[PDB]
Amino acid sequence: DASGGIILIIAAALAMLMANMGATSGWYHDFLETPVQLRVGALEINKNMLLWINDALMAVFFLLIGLEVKRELMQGSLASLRQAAFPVIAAIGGMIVPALLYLAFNYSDPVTREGWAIPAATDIAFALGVLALLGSRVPLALKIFLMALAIIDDLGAIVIIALFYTSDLSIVSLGVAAFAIAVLALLNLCGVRRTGVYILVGAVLWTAVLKSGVHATLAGVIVGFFIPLKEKHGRSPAKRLEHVLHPWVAYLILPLFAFANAGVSLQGVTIDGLTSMLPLGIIAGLLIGKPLGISLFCWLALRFKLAHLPQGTTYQQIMAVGILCGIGFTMSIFIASLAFGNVDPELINWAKLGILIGSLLSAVVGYSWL
Amino acid sequence: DASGGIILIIAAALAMLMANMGATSGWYHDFLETPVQLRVGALEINKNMLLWINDALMAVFFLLIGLEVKRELMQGSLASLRQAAFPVIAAIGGMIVPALLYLAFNYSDPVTREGWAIPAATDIAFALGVLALLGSRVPLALKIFLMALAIIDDLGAIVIIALFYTSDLSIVSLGVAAFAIAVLALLNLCGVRRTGVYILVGAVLWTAVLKSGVHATLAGVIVGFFIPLKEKHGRSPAKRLEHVLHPWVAYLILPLFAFANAGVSLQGVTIDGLTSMLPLGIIAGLLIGKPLGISLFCWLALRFKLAHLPQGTTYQQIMAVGILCGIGFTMSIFIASLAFGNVDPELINWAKLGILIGSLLSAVVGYSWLRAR
């Protein structure tokens, strides 16, 4: 139910408490920046504590998404080219319009315009938690629409970042990554169904691209795509694994990720500081860019014939979830950590402020459409 | 069946090829010798590639042992209240005589006296493997007697090495370790029946004692204890975990440990070199120390009515397990790597030579004689 949503806010509230109390804000920041060096012979992997944690947490979190994308692409909303016509059009609008509003503020600064995909992400656990809070009798199709709409935006942003803006990996790293994916394919063609063997090869895929954070995340998506879904003898590996991971993701992965990232110091924050191009551009793309692009493109889809409509929607509850897609929260925080790495350290801190202001505003306003 | 015993031999044979032919002897030695360093701020751990592998593989293997030895001690072979007090007295003899026979050779050398527990271990996968090889009609109580006999020896060897022949851990490491045992015990009393919560907590215990390979192995059996075994709603967390684990242990963890440790260079190995106090002390401790220690101790317990008897015993079939308990192999190579760490690097290599010869001779004699009776 909505239990994952509340337990996620408590984790972020404690993180905000840790980063703003004089007795804790100091050990909290110094722990996250603790250098961790693994040196295997000549190879060494240097990255701080928070980067190791995020690369491992977001790996198993996107493993669940890869299993959920595979379900909807073969059995759910995205199964047919016509049922998927409504979430995809909503995601395109739910991404280009938030990015346009963000780039409208940050186009003049070449340093901040690289994080245009920050207001395009959507916290699935937070948005689903809001729906389940009032969801005693909300349309079930809305929950599968919101989940399908939020997944493509997050997965696309991860793919778009890992395709272009990423830094290329070692020439040896891609040779092992290609071999691990080939083993994942031969394992799928030969009909093996031991889920652990896919996890085992996934570790080699995750380790080979460890230096790149967005590729270690995509490694989980690739493993989730290759785990078979067939229902032989009434059992399915991907279906079972998605069931097993869900309590661990909703109660340990996402809460820990929120506790290590959603904590910024509020000292010195002013309204004039929050109205600067970086945070306000995130607030605009989340609070306004999300519902403006989702509503417009769905409205464009509806009138201009390429459309559909989930059973029992009424197209005024679409706008309500278009506001709930403005809850970037942990997903926009992770995207901001990828785009603002190895740059000025206050870029990520201002991004987290614009996200949390926009997310809480989009949550309260979207909830108020009872 | 005996599929794990064969894979365990191909991996040891592959390791022997890797550590002998010139095209791979350079890589195989330099790979296991590769130093791996993890620096967490001020903290730092330095262990070679082989130690990082052995601490990870043997911790998983002893999680299975911790599950099996709890199944027996609570509702299985060993059980409670002296049900199977017959393998317990036999295991004392399968360790006292193998160690004393070893020390008869090495007592004059203070360096090799420390490896007295090497001929006391027993490779359960290989010893059970040769049973099932011929075993269309082997007494089933005989098999479970072996498995129960080998676990008591291997667990007692790890405990003794961890209580005396181990290195000191920091008090900060013991504090987190003790706290990890407490939250494990609180998970058990409160009725938590989810395996993943125990393994996660157990991972903290393993990393806390990571600077000691013997304690990282004990972290496996301790977590194997606190996994609940109750049958609520017809489901047991320890039984499903043991069922899931067993194929991994027999097909992945055991062969990989053999491929990484059973590889020794045979160049320069003469017959005179194999009869030194260190190798020959292991040949006698396994090929002779195990049978004489097992047979005599069951016989002294049997005659004095303190013992028992398995079903389908003969008592002439028993000592066929004695020569079968001479199978040290991977379980003795691991004990040898613990007792001969941070010393002359040829002590472990000479010990591995004495472990494989005494085991192979124990396998052939143990098989060629049990097939008769």
To test the contact with chain B by mutation, choose from A30, A32, A34 the residue with the greatest count of B C-beta atoms within 10 A, namely: A34
Nearest to A248 among B35, B36, B196 (CB): B196
Query: Could you give the C-alpha distances from A4 to A255, A332, B26, B355, in angstroms and in order?
Result: 9, 18, 53, 54
Question: 3-state DSSP call for residue A235?
Answer: strand
The answer to whether the CB atoms of A39 and B36 lie below 8 A apart is yes
CB–CB contact B38 A41 (8 Å) = no
**How far off is chain A from B39, nearest CA to CA, in Å?**
5
If interface means Cβ-Cβ distance under 8 Å, which residues of chain B face chain A? Answer: 34-41, 49, 196, 244, 248
Cα separations (Å) of A289 from A12, A95, A128, A283, B109?
A: 24, 8, 19, 9, 80
Given an 8 Å threshold on Cβ–Cβ distance, is A41 in contact with B40?
no
Encode B5-46 in three state secondary structure: HHHHHHHHHHHHHHCCCHHHHHHHHHHHCCEEEEEECCEEEE
CA distance to partner chain A, nearest, from residue B61 (Å): 17
For chain B, the domain total comes to 1
**How close A4 gets to chain B, by Cα (Å)?**
18
**Concatenated DSSP letters for A212-226?**
SHHHHHHHHHHHHHH
**CA A217 remoteness from chain centre:** 10
Please state, in angstroms and rounded to a whole number, the distance separating the CA atoms of residues A95 and A335: 13
Chain B contacts of A35, Cβ < 8 Å?
A: 39, 41
Polymer length in residues for chain B: 373
Rounded distance between C-alpha atoms, residue A301 and residue A311, angstroms: 16
Contacts of B330 (CB under 8 A, 6+ apart): B8, B123, B125, B126, B254, B257, B258, B261, B262
Sheet holding A43-48, edge to edge: A43-48, A35-40, B35-40, B43-48
Give the list of residues 6+ apart from residue B181 with CB closer than 8 angstroms, or none: B205, B222
Q: CA dihedral in degrees (B85, B90, B94, B97; nearest 10)?
A: 120
With CB atoms and an 8 Å threshold, state whether A38 touches B36. yes
How many angstroms away from the CA of A183 is the closest CA of chain B?
Answer: 17
CA distance B153 to chain A (A): 31
Buried b (16+ CB within 10 A) or exposed e, B95-105: bebbbebbeeb
Write out the residue range of the structural domain in which residue B304 sits.
Answer: 1-373
Cβ–Cβ < 8 Å for B286, B119? yes
In B, minimum Cα distance to A49 occurs at B40
Alpha-carbon distance of A113 to A108, in angstroms, equals: 8
Structure tokens of A297?
A: 């493109």
Q: How many CA atoms lie within 13 A of B54 on its CB side?
A: 25
Cβ-in-10-Å burial (0-12, 13-18, 19+) of A123 comes to buried
- Rounded to the nearest angstrom, the minimum Cα separation between B198 and chain A is 13
Q: Which residues contact A3 (CB under 8 A, 6 or more apart)?
A: A250, A251
The half-sphere exposure of B75 on its side-chain side, counting CA atoms within 13 A, is 7
Tokens of A329: 């929260």
Give the DSSP per-residue string, B63-111: HHHHHHHHHHHHHSSSTTTTTTHHHHHHHHHHHHHHHHHHHHHHTT-TT
Q: H or E stretch including A36?
A: strand A35-40
Q: How far is CA A90 from CA A142, A303, A364, A369, B359, in A?
A: 13, 14, 21, 19, 68
Q: Which two tokens stand for residue A60?
A: 């198993």
* Look-up of token digits 């942003």: A157
Q: Which of B40, B47, B55 is nearest to B206 (CA)?
A: B55
- Region label for A309, one of left (φ > 0), alpha (ψ between -120 and 50) or beta (otherwise): beta
Q: Solved by what technique?
A: X-ray
Candidates A41, A49, A196; nearest CB to B35 = A41
Q: Phi/psi class of residue B312: alpha, beta or left (left: φ > 0; alpha: ψ in -120 to 50)? A: left
Residues of B in contact with A60 (CB under 8 A): none
CB B157 within 8 A of CB B366: no
Query: What percent of the residues of chain A are helix, what percent strand, and what percent coil, each to the nearest 5?
Result: 70, 5, 25
Separation in Å, CA B329 to CA A91, A287, B259, B282, B364: 60, 66, 12, 11, 14
Q: Which residue does chain B place closest to A37, by CA atoms?
A: B39
| Among the listed residues B347, B365, B363, B362, the one whose alpha carbon sits nearest the alpha carbon of residue B112 | B347
- Identify whether the C-beta of residue A207 lies closer than 8 Å to the C-beta of residue A56: no
H helices present in A233-289, as ranges: 237-248, 254-261, 271-274, 277-284
Q: What is the enclosing helix (H) or strand (E) of A38? A: strand A35-40
Q: How many CB atoms lie within 10 A of CB A137?
A: 6
Q: How far apart are CA A246 and CA A231, in angstroms?
A: 20
Judged by CB atoms closer than 8 Å, whether chains meet at A37 and B39 is answered as yes
Burial A44-64 (b: 16+ CB within 10 A, else e): eeebebbbbbbbbbbbbbbbb
Distance from CA of A31 to the nearest CA of B (A): 9
- Cβ separation B49–A40 shorter than 8 A: yes
Residue among B143, B11, B161, B125 at smallest CA distance from B76: B143
Cα separation, A296 vs A299, in Å, equals: 5
Residue B47 bridge partners (DSSP): B36
Header resolution in angstroms = 2.4
Give the three-state DSSP class for A167.
coil
B40 to chain A: which residues are within 8 Å by CB? 34, 36, 49
CB pairs under 8 A, 24+ apart, for A276-280? A276/A350, A277/A105, A277/A106, A277/A108, A277/A109, A277/A112, A278/A105, A278/A106, A278/A109, A278/A112, A278/A115, A278/A347, A278/A350, A278/A351, A278/A354, A279/A350, A279/A351, A279/A353, A279/A354, A279/A357, A280/A105, A280/A354
Counting beta carbons within 10 angstroms of the beta carbon of residue B2, is it exposed (0 to 12), middle (13 to 18) or buried (19 or more)? middle
Chain A residue numbers with beta carbons less than 8 Å from the beta carbon of B34 are 40-41
Q: Which residue has the tokens 């609570």?
A: B74
Q: What is the DSSP code (8-state) at residue A305?
A: S
How many Cβ atoms sit within 10 Å of the Cβ of residue B232?
Answer: 10
Nearest to A34 among B34, B37, B40 (CB): B40
Of A140, A98, A86, whose CA–CA distance to A122 is shortest?
A98
Select from A34, A39, A196 the Cβ nearest to the Cβ of B37.
A39
Minimum Cα–Cα distance from A251: chain B residue:
B197
> Residues of A near B (CB-CB distance < 8 A)?
34-41, 49, 196, 248
A290: helix, strand or coil: helix
Q: Is the CB of residue A297 less than 8 Å from the CB of residue A89?
A: yes
Of residues B34, B39, B244, nearest to A41 (C-beta): B34
Q: How far apart are CA A211 and CA A173, in angstroms?
A: 9
Task: Give the gap in angstroms from C-alpha B90 to the nearest C-alpha of chain A.
Answer: 38
Q: DSSP 3-state assignment of A46?
A: strand
Q: How far apart are CA B125 and CA A189, in angstroms?
A: 32
Question: Distance between CA B116 and CA B112 in Å, rounded?
Answer: 8
Burial class (CB in 10 A: 0-12, 13-18, 19+), B277: middle
Residues of B in contact with A38 (CB under 8 A): 36-39
- Report which DSSP code applies to B292: H
